[PDB]
Design a protein around this ligand. Structure first.
Ligand SMILES: NCCC(O)(P(=O)(O)O)P(=O)(O)O
Ligand SMILES: [Mg+2]
Ligand SMILES: [Mg+2]
Ligand SMILES: [Mg+2]
Length: 340
């Protein structure tokens, strides 16, 4: 309830009130069981840590209005995503370049044919395939293909991160901001707005400048606020990918100065979002031209922009609730207790 001053965003607390999807209690346990049954974490670590990681809370505060089974698929995928980030980190730390390379190729393949990988020997690949197959069942194949196109790009950004960290390369500020839109998977979360509101948006709608800019700002806030909040753990873990680190490294900023510059950029996302949110909601109003399809399109854009806004509050409170970032409570600050 009380946020550290250096992380506190009064505009979020006053103007972005938290929302919670009514399915969240069953969501929490169902994802916990999925992590167990897919063997994505040891049973000991699931029982001790899964709930305290707040992964399902993060999604349940974001995709409001989603059908229960859509939110379940999203939450399982999101938990898988955190575990994949953990495997990526461990492969880097132990120099398992071959294991990472093979996983990367398997994920590319599984992304295009998830059914063929539902029982793969690698449980991380099998869990990926199961979540992706379920996400592919909600909307037409044209949405499935866009999801895959986007996630192929994400996988390759993770590979670039692998190269950067093994070689000890800190990306430039602009290089990093470009790469961060892919490692954070901006466009996957944006894609998943549409099954949550039940509608694949035509390209002309979702590429409207107000929709695109609202969608961008929501994810930039989420990624850069994560950078601000995960900075201690990431410095502790020899992580190089973080806006603050790029600023210290290439703009010769101190730690206090870089934190302040990240904080400022986070705050600007909020007020930039508020301005373009008005345009995006005017756009939704214009889509209701009187036809049945127009009303559905209008409702779906409104829902999605609504959830772009919810992302701000969900991500904010998640970083203060989740055990994932409490580096100060670990016996080994470079080894989070929840990774294998
Ligand atoms: N994308 C989820 C994982 C992260 O946000 P986290 O800071 O490790 O929790 P990353 O910074 O690796 O992207
Ligand atoms: Mg990480
Ligand atoms: Mg990462
Ligand atoms: Mg981070």
């Amino acid at each position: 309830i009380a946020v550290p001053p250096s992380l506190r965003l009064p505009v979020i607390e006053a103007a972005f009130p938290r929302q919670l999807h009514p399915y969240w209690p069953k969501l929490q346990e169902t994802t916990r069981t999925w992590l167990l049954e897919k063997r994505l974490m040891p049973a000991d670590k699931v029982e001790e840590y899964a709930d305290g990681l707040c992964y399902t809370d993060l999604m349940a505060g974001y995709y409001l209005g989603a059908p229960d089974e859509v939110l379940q698929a999203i939450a399982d995928y999101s938990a898988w995503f955190f575990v994949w980030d953990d495997r990526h980190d461990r492969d880097i730390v132990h120099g398992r370049a071959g294991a990472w390379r093979r996983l990367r190729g398997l994920l590319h393949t599984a992304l295009d044919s998830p059914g063929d990988h539902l029982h793969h020997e690698d449980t991380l690949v099998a869990g990926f395939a199961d979540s992706v197959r379920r996400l592919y069942a909600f909307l037409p194949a044209t949405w499935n293909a866009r999801f895959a196109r986007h996630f192929h790009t994400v996988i390759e950004a993770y590979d670039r991160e692998f190269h950067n960290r093994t070689r000890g390369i800190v990306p430039g500020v602009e290089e990093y901001l470009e790469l961060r839109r892919l490692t954070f998977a901006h466009w996957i979360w944006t894609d998943l707005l549409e099954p949550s509101s039940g509608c694949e948006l035509p390209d002309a709608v979702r590429k409207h400048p107000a929709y695109r800019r609202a969608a961008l700002l929501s994810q930039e806030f989420a990624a850069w606020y994560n950078d601000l909040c995960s900075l201690p753990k990431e410095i502790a873990g020899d992580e190089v990918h973080n806006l603050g680190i790029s600023l210290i490294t290439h703009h010769s900023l101190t730690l206090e100065e870089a934190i302040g510059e990240v904080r400022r950029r986070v705050e600007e996302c909020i007020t930039e979002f508020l301005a373009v949110e008005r345009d995006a909601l005017r756009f939704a109003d214009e889509l209701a031209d009187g036809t049945v399809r127009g009303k559905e399109l209008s409702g779906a854009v409104r829902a999605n922009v609504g959830n772009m806004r919810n992302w701000f509050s969900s991500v904010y409170w998640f970083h203060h609730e989740s055990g994932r970032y409490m580096v100060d409570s670990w016996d080994d600050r470079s080894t989070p207790p929840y990774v294998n």
